[PDB]
Structures are given as C-alpha cells and as structure tokens.
Design a protein around this ligand. Sequence first.
Ligand SMILES: Nc1ncnc2c1ncn2[C@@H]1O[C@H](COP(=O)(O)O)[C@@H](O)[C@H]1O
Ligand SMILES: Nc1ncnc2c1ncn2[C@@H]1O[C@H](COP(=O)(O)O)[C@@H](O)[C@H]1O
Lengths: 206, 206
Amino acid sequence: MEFKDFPLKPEILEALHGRGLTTPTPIQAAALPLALEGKDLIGQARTGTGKTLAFALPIAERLAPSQERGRKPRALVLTPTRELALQVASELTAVAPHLKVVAVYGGTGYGKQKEALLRGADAVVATPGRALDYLRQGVLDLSRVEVAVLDEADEMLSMGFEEEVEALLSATPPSRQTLLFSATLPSWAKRLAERYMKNPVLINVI
Amino acid sequence: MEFKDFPLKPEILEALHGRGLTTPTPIQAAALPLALEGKDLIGQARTGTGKTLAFALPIAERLAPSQERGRKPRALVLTPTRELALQVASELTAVAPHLKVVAVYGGTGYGKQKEALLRGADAVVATPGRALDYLRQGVLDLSRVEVAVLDEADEMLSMGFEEEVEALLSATPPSRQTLLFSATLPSWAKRLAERYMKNPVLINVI
Ligand SMILES: Nc1ncnc2c1ncn2[C@@H]1O[C@H](COP(=O)(O)O)[C@@H](O)[C@H]1O
Ligand SMILES: Nc1ncnc2c1ncn2[C@@H]1O[C@H](COP(=O)(O)O)[C@@H](O)[C@H]1O
C-alpha cells in the first residue's frame, strides 16, 4: 500500500510526494492504520526503519492548523538527545507544513526556545530535562497535548531521564494518544507503557 | 480503516459484507498491509482478537481460483487441534468463496480426507500429525504452497508437534509467505521463525 492508500490529508500527501516518499516502510505500514485511528502503539524499531514518520504522520494528520498566538502544543515528542530532537523536528516540519514545530533541547541557553514556545507551537520535540524545566517554569504547557511520543525510550532510560519523562507524561491529559518507540523494552519502558498507554499494540521490526 | 480500504478483491469484500464484517480488528489492521503485500508476520495474539482473518484474508486475496482437478494446495494452515482446524477452515471458506478448503485432522479414519485431497484443494487446514502422514503417503503435496500459516504455534509445541510442523514447513517452498500466530513465543517458536520466515514483523495485541 502507498501513502495515498492511508487516510492522510492533502497537505500531507502533497508534502510526502514532494520529497519522493510514496511507500510506507514496514513499521509505517503496520502502524498507520492503528495510529491514524488514534490508537496507542509501541514501535520496537531502530533508526533506519522509518520509525519517525510512523509517529510524525499521525501527528500531522490529527492536528489541524491553528494560528492562535501563544497556543499550547497539541503534540509532544520526547527524544534522548538534541541531535534527535532536531532531526525529528525537521522531519515533522517537513510532513506537517500546516504545523508549527518547536525543538527544545539543552546545551544552550533558555531564552530562544522559551520565546519560541511563548509565541505558540503545535508540536514540541524535546529532550526531557529541558522540557521539564520549561514545564515547571510555566513556559511549556502540556495540558492540551493530544499525542505524546516517546522516541527512543530505552535511550532516555539509559541517560537517566526516567523521572523527567514520567513527569512530562503526567502533565499531559490521559485522553491523549501515546506512541512509544524503543528498540528494546526494559522493564521501566514496559511499566511506562502499562501506566501511560491504552492497550497499545506492539509492532516489532527489529 | 474499513476492509474496503485495504487491497482486497471483490469476492472477498462481498463475502465480508455478507457477514457484517466491516472494520478490521487491531491485529487485522496492523497485519493486512504487510500480509497483503506478501510479507511474513508473527501475530502474537489469542482467539478473540480476530487473528483468523488476519491470515485468512491474505490467503483469500493471494489465491485466485482454480478448477484444476487434483490440484495441490497453495495454502497450508496448521492448527493444534481438530476443533481449530474445522473452525479455521470454516472461516477461510467463508471469506474465500472462490477457494476449495480442505480440513485435515485426526480422531477419524484416513479415507474421507484423502479423497478430498486427491480431488484437489486450494487450501488445507490441518493438524500436523495427520498432515505429515498424508505428506509421507504422497496424498498431500505441499510443493505448491505459497502461504503457510502456523496457527497457535505454542500449542502445537505443547502438544509435541514440533517435528511434524518442521517437516511440513520443510516440504513447502521457501519462496512462500509464512505467517505465524502464537500467544506466546517459546524458544522453539522463535527458532521456527528464524529458520522458516523472512524478516517477519511481529505484531502483538496480547
Ligand atoms: N516511507 C519511506 N520511504 C522512503 N524513505 C523513508 C520512508 N520513511 C522514512 N524514510 C527515510 O528513512 C530513514 C530512516 O528513518 P528513521 O528510521 O525514522 O530514522 C530516513 O532517511 C527517512 O527519510
Ligand atoms: N473484523 C471483525 N469484525 C467483527 N468480528 C470479527 C472480525 N474479525 C473477526 N471477528 C470475529 O472475532 C472472533 C474471534 O476471532 P479469532 O480471534 O480469529 O478467533 C470471531 O467470532 C470472528 O468472527
């Protein structure tokens, strides 16, 4: 099946076509019907599988544009690293031209991202420490999150972000959709899934 | 997504509609794009999930009708029990009106099934002991199998059918598609997957 065979809106199919993206990878093909229907998913997959679009497409599809100044994000993606935050943000921006994506990460000052968040965002792609700092400063508001994604949960564990990840998830409404990607499923990630996800289907392409 | 949103041929959508089947269950929704594209899948799922159609639909879709007298089956489904063989056969018959499905099982004499097989079949749904007896008698010919399904691999293990299952799979061409369903994945089933499947995606709805 091609991307056009899935329930994806025009601006997304046009964006995909513009980058020569036509045919879902296996994790995308298996995930999309579920994820596009709002269901929670665990994607056991590493980079190279197309896992990013497996969550970025759902986000793109579910979120309609908004121009509301100062608006709070409706999608949150957590990543272990600045590098992956930037990469994921770029990809989401590319498949969701209708959305404002803000990347949040450390190894830099707080001002620029704070001001981006305060201007308004539809999606935030963040490393957990910096995200939690903004949450607790009242700069990042997660009360409107509809889709939360943990991208490389095992790495976030290895880097000691468990408490941050949990605090961030706890700040989002449980009505959300949650997608969890991880190559491995250590017991913390399994617990995270049990606590923060709704009967997720697991798709493993390892 | 509804069944009509997947690449299923008219006789199958008509059959589904005739039974009021419209919307894939989660394992179906995740499996179909992969399975309809010929890919191998492990479905970690128990009865109640819709796992049967997750493999019966692919079989139905891939196999065009044939009227060839004495033809050898192009699909093989192995089940642990007579009861499940009969149930799966019934379901496959119902979604594949264009195919002749033969159930093979023990606890009965050999004549009736032998004669059914010799008349020709498109799909055989069998328990492993009886299937292997027919194979070795030269009555069941598996050289044309295009789709093999292990349905409840863990149960087939628990009932001591490992050697039979392996012999049967070994008799099918490796060019086939293989689908393996099992609630649990004991090491024999994992080995079976490694040996007899091609990079399968695992979908777990447990
Ligand atoms: N469906 C697709 N078709 C072609 N390339 C893809 C597709 N999905 C993702 N990619 C590329 O696959 C690579 C790995 O993606 P990921 O596994 O998300 O890190 C990236 O270079 C993506 O641009
Ligand atoms: N997509 C579906 N919609 C409604 N009922 C279904 C669907 N797929 C399977 N069923 C029913 O689900 C039950 C369990 O199927 P299984 O898990 O394959 O044993 C059976 O009663 C099937 O008829």
